[PDB]
Design a protein around this ligand. Structure first.
Ligand code: NA
Length: 223
């Protein structure tokens, strides 16, 4: 799957690493992502990620209501209440950050209550000098072990160290549906990831930049 994605600061669509400002119409943007055939969408609430007390619930309610396809939302999700709040806003899956790295027993609890189909674990992966896949702020393997007993199913992988990693880990963990994020700059990057075993590709920047349209991405990826 192609998974189009918007990063949000307040009501404002942005490019980040803040880099560029693209307006205050996330909804027509999303709806046009959907019109072209996107099956899943992806939001990051950077305002909430900065401080969770300012979680943009009303906004996210609106955005999720305005489209008729599942939406996954991340950004500062670090307590059970936040997960419930996001779900209560209509969100189809909650994307969890570094907490799932730091606090396995808590997060295991979230899995046990909400179920694994509702959660996505977001991991920044570093390949080090030695060739170990480590997980940013512990190895990938270690994490997968920690969460297999509670039915781990969805991982969002950003590589911050490209095809071959995904080939190997997708082969090692056939029970995990991997999502690649970052590293997309043109339609060819999408073609590249096509046969790797990766299940979903997060696409953001390239779309705002007009390199291609979601219809083109889908044409590519879906061969
Ligand atoms: Na697709």
């Amino acid at each position: 799957m192609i998974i189009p994605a918007l990063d949000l600061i307040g009501d404002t669509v942005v490019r980040v690493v803040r880099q560029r400002d693209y307006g205050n119409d996330p909804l027509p943007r999303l709806q046009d992502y959907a019109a072209q055939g996107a099956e899943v969408l992806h939001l990051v609430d950077l305002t909430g990620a900065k401080d969770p007390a300012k979680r943009q619930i009303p906004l996210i309610k609106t955005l999720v209501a305005g489209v008729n396809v599942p939406v996954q939302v991340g950004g500062g999700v670090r307590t059970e209440e936040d997960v419930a709040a996001l779900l209560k806003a209509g969100v189809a899956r909650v994307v969890i950050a570094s907490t799932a790295v730091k606090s396995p027993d808590v997060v295991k609890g979230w899995f046990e209550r909400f179920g694994a189909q509702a959660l996505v674990l977001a991991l920044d992966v570093r390949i080090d000098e030695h060739g170990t896949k480590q997980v940013a702020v512990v190895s990938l393997e270690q994490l997968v072990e920690t969460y297999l007993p509670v039915g781990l199913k969805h991982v969002l992988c950003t590589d911050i160290s490209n095809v071959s990693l995904y080939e190997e880990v997708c082969a090692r963990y056939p029970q995990i549906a991997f999502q690649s994020s970052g590293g997309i700059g043109d339609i060819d990057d999408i073609a590249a990831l096509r046969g790797t075993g990766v299940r979903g590709v997060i696409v953001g920047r390239a779309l705002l930049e007009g390199k291609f349209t979601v219809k083109e991405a889908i044409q590519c990826w879906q061969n």
